[PDB]
Amino acid sequence: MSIQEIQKEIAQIQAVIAGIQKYIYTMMSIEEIQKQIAAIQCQIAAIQKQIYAMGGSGMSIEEIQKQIAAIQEQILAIYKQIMAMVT
Amino acid sequence: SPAWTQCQQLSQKLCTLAWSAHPLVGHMDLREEGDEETTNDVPHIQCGDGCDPQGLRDNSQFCLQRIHQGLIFYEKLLGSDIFTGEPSLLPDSPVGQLHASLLGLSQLLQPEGHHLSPSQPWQRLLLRFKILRSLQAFVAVAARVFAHGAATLSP
Amino acid sequence: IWELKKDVYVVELDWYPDAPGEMVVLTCDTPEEDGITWTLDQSSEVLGSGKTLTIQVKEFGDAGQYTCHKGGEVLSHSLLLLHKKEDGIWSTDILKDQKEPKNKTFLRCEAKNYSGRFTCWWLTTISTDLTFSVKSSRGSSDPQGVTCGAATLSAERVRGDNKEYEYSVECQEDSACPAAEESLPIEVMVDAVHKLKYENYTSSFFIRDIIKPDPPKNLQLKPLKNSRQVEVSWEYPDTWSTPHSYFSLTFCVQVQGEKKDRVFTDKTSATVICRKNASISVRAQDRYYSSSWSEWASVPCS
Ligand SMILES: *[C@@H]1O[C@H](CO)[C@@H](O[C@@H]2O[C@H](CO)[C@@H](O[C@@H]3O[C@H](CO[C@H]4O[C@H](CO)[C@@H](O)[C@H](O)[C@@H]4O)[C@@H](O)[C@H](O[C@H]4O[C@H](CO)[C@@H](O)[C@H](O)[C@@H]4O)[C@@H]3O)[C@H](O)[C@H]2NC(C)=O)[C@H](O)[C@H]1NC(C)=O
Ligand code: NA
Ligand code: NA
Numbered sequence A: 001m002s003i004q005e006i007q008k009e010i011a012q013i014q015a016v017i018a019g020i021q022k023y024i025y026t027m028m029s030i031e032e033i034q035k036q037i038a039a040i041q042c043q044i045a046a047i048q049k050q051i052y053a054m055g056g057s058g059m060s061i062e063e064i065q066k067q068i069a070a071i072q073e074q075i076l077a078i079y080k081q082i083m084a085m086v087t
Numbered sequence B: 001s002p003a004w005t006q007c008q009q010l011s012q013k014l015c016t017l018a019w020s021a022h023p024l025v026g027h028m029d030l031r032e033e034g035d036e037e038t039t040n041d042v043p044h045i046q047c048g049d050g051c052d053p054q055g056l057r058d059n060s061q062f063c064l065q066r067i068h069q070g071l072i073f074y075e076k077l078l079g080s081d082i083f084t085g086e087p088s089l090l091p092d093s094p095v096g097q098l099h100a101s102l103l104g105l106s107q108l109l110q111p112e113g114h115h116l117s118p119s120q121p122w123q124r125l126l127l128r129f130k131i132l133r134s135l136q137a138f139v140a141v142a143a144r145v146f147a148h149g150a151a152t153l154s155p
Numbered sequence C: 001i002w003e004l005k006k007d008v009y010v011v012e013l014d015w016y017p018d019a020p021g022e023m024v025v026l027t028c029d030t031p032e033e034d035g036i037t038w039t040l041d042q043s044s045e046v047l048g049s050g051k052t053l054t055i056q057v058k059e060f061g062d063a064g065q066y067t068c069h070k071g072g073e074v075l076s077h078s079l080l081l082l083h084k085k086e087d088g089i090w091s092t093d094i095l096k097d098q099k100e101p102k103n104k105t106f107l108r109c110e111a112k113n114y115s116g117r118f119t120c121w122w123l124t125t126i127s128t129d130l131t132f133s134v135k136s137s138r139g140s141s142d143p144q145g146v147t148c149g150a151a152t153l154s155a156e157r158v159r160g161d162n163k164e165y166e167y168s169v170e171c172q173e174d175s176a177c178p179a180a181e182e183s184l185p186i187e188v189m190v191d192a193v194h195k196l197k198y199e200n201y202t203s204s205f206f207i208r209d210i211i212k213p214d215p216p217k218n219l220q221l222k223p224l225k226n227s228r229q230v231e232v233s234w235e236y237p238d239t240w241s242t243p244h245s246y247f248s249l250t251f252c253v254q255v256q257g258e259k260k261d262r263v264f265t266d267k268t269s270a271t272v273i274c275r276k277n278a279s280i281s282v283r284a285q286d287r288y289y290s291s292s293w294s295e296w297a298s299v300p301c302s
Helices: A003-026 A030-051 A061-086 B004-020 B035-040 B053-059 B061-078 B094-109 B121-152
Strands: C002-005 C008-014 C022-027 C037-040 C052-057 C064-070 C073-086 C108-110 C117-124 C130-138 C144-148 C152-159 C162-173 C186-194 C197-205 C217-223 C229-235 C249-256 C261-265 C269-273 C279-286 C297-300
Touching: A003 A030, A003 A061, A003 B121, A030 A061, A061 B121, B004 B094, B004 B121, B053 B061, B053 B121, B061 B094, B061 B121, B094 B121, C008 C022, C052 C064, C108 C197, C117 C186, C130 C162, C217 C279, C217 C297, C229 C279, C249 C269, C261 C269
Parallel strands: C008 C073, C073 C197
Antiparallel strands: C002 C008, C022 C052, C037 C064, C064 C073, C108 C117, C117 C162, C130 C144, C130 C186, C144 C162, C152 C162, C186 C197, C217 C229, C229 C269, C249 C261, C249 C279, C279 C297
């Protein structure tokens, strides 16, 4: 997958988690969920350095795509927790 | 034609819920090149639909028909698999309350009026942000129409 | 190579050290067929003869004004500018990244109302040899007319030990519908030329999303005798869309000089409790859609 596409996916993920973060302000542990959100944002920053650089090593493209998918699943789990809390 | 102050109250509530029911993104976020075609299939209160103050003074029925159509459209969208599918929102969720408020207003306008989809959960979620910010734009125009009618058209 | 405007051309280049660049063929815009020569900028060195000139464009020394002549008279001119692509990305040297609301935000636009008029701003460190050109439309595939004025200096300030120049431009949609629900965004397109370097920039938005009302007008305080209670009053700003019965505003009233003593109202008056050295401040937002709050209007307490 292109670097342009990967940066688009990262931008979307940054927008969604920023929005979830703001939504939590407007409202089973909130402090815990906010820490998980911040940790994802933190990992996005570390991943961005892997991108702008283009038994142990750094990340390939495929490995970046796999981590993005994993981050999306973590965001979906958080989103589902929050939606259940406000319902 | 019909209960201006009642429509004002309900359309104001719709604006509040459209913004509070669900997380938001920035207006420059989640934009893409194909959005021009996607926008075309959604109904809008367009130039010339009669919802400007002068058109409302002349004959508000044109505007209110367009508002009713848009409300019916967004009710169908908010009740579709985009919102009920994985990650699922329940009918009693804030988005479910927003859906019920669309229905309440459309019923007030025409009591006897009668009432595409992605498969991946991440894509459903993205589309929810896009649909709801479109809805925010629509219900803001509707709320101005009813506020102005209540202020200037109520005998 | 493509034509930016009459007799002005842009050559796109993959830009890296010792890059070979692009071969271009310039044609003298003339009926003549014999006795033609070419030069560049001020030098009289004849670079070539004939109706056409083939040149290798790979650095700024190859850009500039190419002139063809016959019989000592100038026949035509061709100005070549370079558009650098650095590692697959077009250069953005000329404008400063404002990094808000996101990375690569070079243009910022605001509207005071729904009239279809708006203003855009950008920042640069460059002081000389600098030209901007602004165009706008509503929609990209089927563009609807927007008329823009000239971009000109609006402020000069010092930031990080160097001058920062702010430019602004005013634009007006030709056939605006203040009350309608926009379905196609405004596009703003800015050409920037610094010497022989060409860049361009874009912003896309709905007017409703860049709304920022002017501050409340005529903010006044009426103190109550023997109390710190005060009646606050104000008016809608002159520039806001009319009629106000349609384009309603909402307001935030704050008393401050640590905490946040705020109330929200749709009226143009409120009752609050003042204290010394504190100010009463009021700001405004579109009642029905969450765009930007106005700047504060403020009056001191007492
Ligand atoms: C911001 O900056 C960018 C990057 O520099 C500009 O993008 C360039 O825009 C120009 C002008 O539109 C483009 O040049 C034009 O391209 C047209 C399409 O060319 C493609 O397709 C042909 C096949 O038909 C290919 O051969 C070609 O290589 C391209 O792949 C052409 O039709 C245009 O030709 C014009 O001139 C000839 C004679 O010279 C006429 O016969 C034609 O009828 C026509 O009038 C022209 O070449 C250029 O391709 C863009 N670059 C990229 C990378 O996309 C943006 O335009 C600029 N933004 C603004 C607002 O100016
Ligand atoms: Na820059
Ligand atoms: Na007093």
